[PDB]
Design a protein around this ligand. Structure first.
Ligand SMILES: C[C@@H]1CN(Cc2ccc(F)cc2)[C@@H](C)CN1C(=O)c1cc2c(C(=O)C(=O)N(C)C)cn(C)c2cc1Cl
Ligand SMILES: CCCCCCCCO[C@@H]1O[C@H](CO)[C@@H](O)[C@H](O)[C@H]1O
Length: 331
């Protein structure tokens, strides 16, 4: 049958299994409380979606978020321990709560603007890439990978969730579309660089500065890249710049493990088609001590056809309700 609920003001209405509700992040992740799950003995985070069925777009967003989190089942990706509503029917259904592991910190919190050891960077980047492989295998592109979106606990176990512009692929900065999954690989390279050196790779002051700093490291586009640019305004502007050569990453990241440097060379290539994939990165010798080709799992096909659909509020709501009811908690 149905769990007993209680009501509290932080008027959250949750099952009794969740105790010690305490607001976290204040606003950054929405309305989220840390809590203790008495059923599992785990510290959890409970998110109450805001106004989930106020509008078609709210409704579609609610459905999108629930679908995604229900699909993501991987050690290095945030997924769902639980989903619940106080509603006992569809006509009653107005609130949606998601539950996941309370990791307790994000990457910023672990680095502290300091140098990590090479071994530690291997472990952290390995986890990010393991998680990314899974995500990309579901035909998902993250698009905003950054330290604040990488959750970590005290044992630096890491899960991918979900300052601002510093990790973004340059094609994203320039509103390219046709985006490759390797946009996320660019983001990994920027993160890795920072963990090794203790400094932001491209700390741009604004958008244009950010692209200037990128180009100074990885050079101006070669002919092979320029032949794939269909916008003549973009093409013509690029060529009018002073040519710069790629910097030698070996001089830039001096002291670094040469295999770390080699991996950075392969991630931080301007041409997204020439960037290493997550699967390929995991097989790179940098991660010899953690790589296991038989425990780098991939995802079930992920049907995102709903994105192209224009439905009514009550349709998105009923579909969301269906997903709440069909949820099966992880073993
Ligand atoms: C992934 C979980 C769940 N939570 C949101 C969430 C996502 C999906 C879901 F189903 C339920 C909740 C994230 C916002 C943060 N989160 C954390 O573990 C977390 C938790 C914290 C955190 C705190 O816990 C905190 O405020 N203190 C005082 C320890 C401080 N920071 C910087 C944090 C960063 C993260 Cl990523
Ligand atoms: C002015 C700064 C130059 C930025 C060049 C970004 C090149 C990224 O690379 C491009 O990514 C596209 C997908 O996003 C692909 O369709 C292209 O084939 C690929 O070359």
């Amino acid at each position: 049958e149905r769990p007993t609920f209680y009501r509290q003001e932080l008027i959250w209405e949750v099952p009794e299994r969740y105790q010690n509700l305490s607001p976290v992040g204040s606003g950054a992740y929405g309305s989220v409380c840390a809590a203790f799950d008495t059923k599992t003995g785990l510290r959890v985070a409970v998110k109450k979606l805001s106004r989930p069925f106020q509008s078609i777009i709210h409704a579609k967003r609610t459905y999108r978020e629930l679908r995604l989190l229900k699909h993501m089942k991987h050690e290095n990706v945030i997924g769902l321990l639980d989903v619940f509503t106080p509603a006992r029917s569809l006509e009653e259904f107005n609130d949606v709560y998601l539950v996941t592991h309370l990791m307790g910190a994000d990457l910023n919190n672990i680095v502290k603007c300091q140098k990590l050891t090479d071994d530690h960077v291997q472990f952290l980047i390995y986890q990010i890439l393991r998680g990314l492989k899974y995500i990309h295998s579901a035909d998902i592109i993250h698009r905003d990978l950054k330290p604040s979106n990488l959750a970590v606990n005290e044992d630096c176990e890491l899960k991918i969730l979900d300052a601002t512009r510093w990790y973004r692929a340059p094609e994203i900065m320039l509103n390219w579309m046709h985006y490759n999954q390797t946009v996320d690989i660019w983001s990994v390279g920027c993160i890795m660089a920072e963990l090794l050196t203790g400094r932001t790779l491209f700390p741009g002051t604004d958008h244009i500065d950010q692209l200037k700093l990128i180009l100074r490291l990885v050079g101006t586009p070669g002919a092979e890249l320029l032949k794939k640019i269909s916008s003549e305004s973009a093409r013509n502007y690029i060529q009018s710049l002073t040519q710069m050569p790629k910097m030698n990453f070996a001089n830039v990241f001096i002291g670094a493990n040469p295999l770390a440097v080699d991996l950075l060379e392969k991630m931080l290539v301007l041409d997204s088609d020439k960037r290493i994939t997550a699967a390929q990165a995991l097989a790179h010798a940098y991660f010899a001590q953690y790589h296991d080709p038989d425990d780098e799992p991939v995802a079930d096909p992920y049907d995102q056809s709903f994105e192209s659909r224009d439905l009514l509020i009550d349709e998105w709501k009923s579909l969301t309700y269906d997903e709440v009811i069909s949820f099966v908690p992880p073993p």
